[PDB]
């Protein structure tokens, strides 16, 4: 693959500070590689693989993102996600590759900090997370907690893009995810509490929704038992219940409804509910009654009311 090497040569030229001739070579080979890569997803022409991996192209394309023009950056993402999906027999060679070249993952993560390459970075990153091995390397790294900064990042676009990656990492692979959340409880949920206190509307919303999703998965049962035993967390759901915004309240309900539904509430949790019994009934009875379509919701409300009434 002359192409692989010309792209690397052509990119090394850009990497300094001719630019037109290289800027134009780079696009061209970017287009050629896209064009080669449109064929199928174990024969001696695994020499092409050995060649790709050896050349270090996949890092350079990621590391050099910023020297590349806007349509170029889409090509890179496309090229890259294409190489990462390919299978040789049962293995996924690129997955094993990046296991040995972890800085590819950490460069992609770090891209959310660059408004000019954020969105390409997330495209490549969500493609990596598809693979338990790379998700695992990202979950167990300290760089993971950068997501709490990025999701409140800047512009709407990026922040929503970071969150989707955030979300996927925490839900796609259940056993690994449950495992992360158990080993990192205090740290993770202290950081998550900060998100719940956010003044940003999209932030509380997304986080609330994800929270309830995290807590209702049977894989996270212990994470959950714990979380719903903390008076502090309950007061937080309850205060989110009176948020000026009907979408926040709705999401807070779904976290709230878990604290109450739990057959064994710790004494502190019980006591909170009882302290505010009358006020709870009065809230629930009036709470978003115009939402009639959602049967499960109506039922949940009607149950909490009895439970509470039944304390």
UniProtKB/Swiss-Prot annotation:
An MF annotation (GO) of this entry: protein serine/threonine kinase binding
GO biological-process terms attached to the record: cellular hypotonic response; intracellular signal transduction; negative regulation of potassium ion transmembrane transport; positive regulation of protein serine/threonine kinase activity; response to activity; response to thyroid hormone; signal transduction
A GO cellular component annotation in the UniProt record: secretory granule lumen
Main location group: cytoplasm
Gene3D superfamilies named in the record: Leucine-rich Repeat Variant (1.25.10.10)
Cellular localization per UniProt: Cytoplasm
Domain of life: Eukaryota
Pfam family of the protein (one): Mo25
Keyword terms, alphabetized: Cytoplasm
Subunit structure: Component of a trimeric complex composed of STK11/LKB1, STRAD (STRADA or STRADB) and CAB39/MO25 (CAB39/MO25alpha or CAB39L/MO25beta): the complex tethers STK11/LKB1 in the cytoplasm and stimulates its catalytic activity.
Family designation: Belongs to the Mo25 family.
Function: Component of a complex that binds and activates STK11/LKB1. In the complex, required to stabilize the interaction between CAB39/MO25 (CAB39/MO25alpha or CAB39L/MO25beta) and STK11/LKB1.
Protein name: Calcium-binding protein 39
Protein species of origin: Homo sapiens (Human)
């Amino acid at each position: 693959a002359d192409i692989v090497k010309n792209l690397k040569e052509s990119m090394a030229v850009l990497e300094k500070q001719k630019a037109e001739k290289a800027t134009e070579e780079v696009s061209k080979n970017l287009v050629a590689m896209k064009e080669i890569l449109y064929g199928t997803n174990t024969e001696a022409v695994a020499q092409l693989a050995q060649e790709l991996y050896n050349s270090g192209l996949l890092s350079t394309l990621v590391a050099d993102l910023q020297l590349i023009d806007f349509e170029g950056k889409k090509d890179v993402a496309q090229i890259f996600n294409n190489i990462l999906r390919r299978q040789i027999g049962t293995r996924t060679p690129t997955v094993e590759y990046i296991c040995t070249q972890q800085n590819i993952l950490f460069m992609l993560l770090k891209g959310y900090e660059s408004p000019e390459i954020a969105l390409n970075c997330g495209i490549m990153l969500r493609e990596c997370i598809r693979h338990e091995p790379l998700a695992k390397i990202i979950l167990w790294s300290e760089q993971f907690y950068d997501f709490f900064r990025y999701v409140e990042m800047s512009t709407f676009d990026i922040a929503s893009d970071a969150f989707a990656t955030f979300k996927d990492l925490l839900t796609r692979h259940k056993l690994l995810s449950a495992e992360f959340l158990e080993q990192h409880y205090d740290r993770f949920f202290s950081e998550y509490e900060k998100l719940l206190h956010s003044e940003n509307y999209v932030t509380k919303r997304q986080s609330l929704k994800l929270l309830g999703e995290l807590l209702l998965d049977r894989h996270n049962f212990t994470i959950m038992t714990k979380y719903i035993s903390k008076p502090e967390n309950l007061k937080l759901m309850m205060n989110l219940l009176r948020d000026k915004s009907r979408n926040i309240q709705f999401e807070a309900f779904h976290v709230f409804k878990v604290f109450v539904a739990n057959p064994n509430k710790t004494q502190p949790i019980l006591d909170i509910l009882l302290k505010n019994q009358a006020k709870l009934i009065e809230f629930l009875s009036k709470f978003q009654n115009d939402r009639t379509e959602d049967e499960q919701f109506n039922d949940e409300k009607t149950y909490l009311v009895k439970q509470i009434r039944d304390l």
